[PDB]
């Protein structure tokens, strides 16, 4: 019973930090999109 | 669910480092659109001075 207490909390602990990689990762997807259409828009500038 | 928890931060952190080089690549490829883009607009303007 201690030891599947103990794990189970290592268990959680391995989840918040899956899902902070997570958020980060929802951040950087969006950092993705953002920068693809302003580089597409820069580059029509550019072309102008 | 241990294991299944450590497998999925595995290939979560594959797919972060993928996503993080293209996050790299992109905004410099941005940074030098708007660079040359300024730098076009320099180059029309001395034209129009000759």
């Known amino acids: 019973q201690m030891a599947n207490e103990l794990m189970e909390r290592q268990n959680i602990q391995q989840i918040s930090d899956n899902k902070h990689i997570e958020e980060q990762l929802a951040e950087k997807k969006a950092d993705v999109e953002i920068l693809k259409n302003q580089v597409s828009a820069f580059a029509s500038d550019l072309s102008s | ?50």
């Open chain 2, 1 to 50: 669910e241990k294991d299944y928890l450590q497998k999925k931060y595995n290939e979560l952190q594959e797919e972060k480092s993928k996503l993080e080089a293209q996050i790299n690549l992109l905004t410099q490829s941005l940074r030098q659109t708007e660079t040359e883009a300024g730098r076009a607009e320099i180059d029309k303007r001395n034209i129009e001075d000759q």
